[PDB]
Amino acid sequence: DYIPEPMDLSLVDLPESLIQLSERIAENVHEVWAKARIDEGWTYGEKRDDIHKKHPCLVPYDELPEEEKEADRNTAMNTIKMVKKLGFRIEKE
Amino acid sequence: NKLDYIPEPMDLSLVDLPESLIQLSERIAENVHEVWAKARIDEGWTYGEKRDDIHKKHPCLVPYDELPEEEKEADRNTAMNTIKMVKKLGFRIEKE
Numbered sequence: 001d002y003i004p005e006p007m008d009l010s011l012v013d014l015p016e017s018l019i020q021l022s023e024r025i026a027e028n029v030h031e032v033w034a035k036a037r038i039d040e041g042w043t044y045g046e047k048r049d050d051i052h053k054k055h056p057c058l059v060p061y062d063e064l065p066e067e068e069k070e071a072d073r074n075t076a077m078n079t080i081k082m083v084k085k086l087g088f089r090i091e092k093e
Numbered sequence: 094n095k096l097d098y099i100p101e102p103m104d105l106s107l108v109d110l111p112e113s114l115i116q117l118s119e120r121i122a123e124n125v126h127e128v129w130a131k132a133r134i135d136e137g138w139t140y141g142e143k144r145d146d147i148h149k150k151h152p153c154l155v156p157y158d159e160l161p162e163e164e165k166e167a168d169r170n171t172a173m174n175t176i177k178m179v180k181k182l183g184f185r186i187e188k189e
Binding site for chain 1: 098100101102103111114117120121124125126127128129130131134140144146154155156171172174175176178179182183184185186187188189
């Protein structure tokens with residue numbers, strides 16, 4: 001049934017000062033996520049396992065494969081781009 | 094080996110976003126879902142009632158509006174916590 005049709009955001013221009021911060025944003029979004037899982041019993045596991053509550057990404061953000069770091073930064077940049085697209089101004093103070 | 098991983102996220106509890114932006118968190122989180130979904134489908138993941146990594150079956154591979162509301166809340170929060178961090182790092186966010 002399901003064909004996802006995301007919004008085209010490729011022509012949204014964010015401030016360069018903000019894009020240089022992708023890493024920092026992505027890291028904190030990662031740490032929040034980690035705290036939630038740790039506080040529900042999740043621990044590190046070489047392979048992801050829902051029943052024994054393991055997960056290979058329950059590591060410090062810098063210890064993540066850059067694959068996943070890339071994913072995180074792009075999630076954040078797309079999140080912020082939707083915001084500019086919805087009629088909001090983003091400017092450095 | 095007993096240095097272990099203590100997450101310590103930034104304290105965003107005092108960051109105030111514009112209300113009209115919070116009112117839109119559903120729309121933002123939906124489009125993040127459309128992107129994650131389109132990504133997974135393009136590498137063969139499909140829907141299944143329970144999650145399985147061997148056949149690439151995931152229960153959230155559904156239209157956003159049909160997600161269980163616990164998942165929707167998660168999404169809205171990631172999105173508002175993402176842009177709170179943008180405010181905290183010293184960027185102004187106003188409606189146009």
